[PDB]
Amino acid sequence: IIGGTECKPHSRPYMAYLEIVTSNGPSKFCGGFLIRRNFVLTAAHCAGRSITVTLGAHNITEEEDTWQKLEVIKQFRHPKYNTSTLHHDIMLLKLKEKASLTLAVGTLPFVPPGRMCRVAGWGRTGVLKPGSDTLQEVKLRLMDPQACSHFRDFDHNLQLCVGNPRKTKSAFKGDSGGPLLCAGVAQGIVSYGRSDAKPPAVFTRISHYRPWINQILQAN
Ligand SMILES: Cc1cccc2scc(Cn3c(SCCCC(=O)O)nc4ccccc43)c12
């Protein structure tokens, strides 16, 4: 998160931290969010050969008794996700086990408006800056699909366009999989943007995927 502020500790009890392990040399992290005791929602590009979800965290280096750390037993990336258009950048992860719903671990209930949104993550706070230990949140303005014109592969039906170009505030590298919340409702998922950090950034439109989602949760 660029140009945000530290969340109050444990205000986002649905925020997952993910440690992805790649078949090559492992090591990257994404955000996510708990939507069912044993289901976490995140961006498709965060797939790896193994993933460990840390729920309940705020400073992710400091261990504390709100934490619950779980392995992922099944990776459910969208069948139509395409690595060179980044369409359908959405993945559900099945946890080994049902997380305990506590104050600090809970699910996410499955004139500008209305289109005032927040996003949080532990990702980079500048273009080549380190990530954040403490979970960071930023307030972003949702936008017209014309603002994301330069992103050759944007589709207004599949994706949202987030952030004021005139401002520095944005989700960034390592924020992927994070949920965008507009007036209380989860509307988007951090996907990508320009590597120079200049807003707007593209997020996956959750609304387009509620049918495929509830499909995964009906089996499984
Ligand atoms: C999330 C974000 C916001 C604004 C600009 C940019 S530029 C790259 C990213 C996120 N991202 C990254 S950054 C490092 C990997 C972890 C992450 O995905 O954030 N690698 C990607 C591969 C495919 C699609 C997206 C990827 C990103």
Residue numbers in the entry: 16 to 36, 36A, 36B, 36C, 37 to 61, 63 to 123, 130 to 148, 150 to 169, ...
Sentences from the paper on this structure:
Chymase is a mast-cell-specific serine protease that is stored within secretory granules and released together with heparin and histamine in response to allergen challenge or other stimuli. Recent studies have shown that chymases possess processing activity for biological peptides and cytokines implicated in a variety of diseases. For example, the chymases of primates and dogs have highly specific angiotensin II (Ang II) generating activity, and the results of animal studies suggest that chymase contributes to the pathogenesis of cardiovascular diseases via Ang II generation. Based on the results of these studies, inhibition of chymase is expected to provide therapeutic means for the treatment of these diseases.
